[PDB]
Amino acid sequence: EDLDTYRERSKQLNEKFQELRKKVNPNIMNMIENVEKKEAALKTMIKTIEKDKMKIQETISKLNEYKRETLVK
Amino acid sequence: LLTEEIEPKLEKLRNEKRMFLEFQSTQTDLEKTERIVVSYEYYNIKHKH
């Protein structure tokens, strides 16, 4: 009225391990949303870096040709 | 440098999410096993009674 051997011990160990995770994780939804927005920001920053390197190289590599073509004419 | 120094916190959050989901699944399986064991023990106690 109040309420295979190693299975109960494993269940108790799993329960104790979950209790050792007392850090509140009911906000995992908004945590994953913040993770997603921060990863989107990181992808935009990586795109910024790659386009910046492309600009740095292409600006000079095109200005050399522009000058060499304009000065002669 | 700032991003690679904060990346420890990103990995800590990834752990606190993945291990949290794993612990939730383990707690579900433990509740199922506990219910099965409780049913078996109740049947045995009823037979003994």
Next chain:
Amino acid sequence: ESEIKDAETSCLSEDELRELDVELIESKINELSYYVEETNVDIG
């Protein structure tokens, strides 16, 4: 081996094993459980 050394040292032996009250020990255990329920110790 703290749980063994302390047990061997605590077990005169009869006076040190009977003078302690059970109600105080139960209250201390309950307080320890309540503290560990929200402690969340870490090496951070």
Next chain:
Amino acid sequence: MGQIENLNEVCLEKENRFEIVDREKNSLESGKETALEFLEKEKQLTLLR
């Protein structure tokens, strides 16, 4: 003067950016120290038990 002054300004700005708050980590450390003191009290009570 110009070059050394602008280099010193940017290096001071970087050093400040490295130490903007210096309190959030300290706050987390104080919280973890309080948690460790609570855990030590719990361990003493467990040894008594």
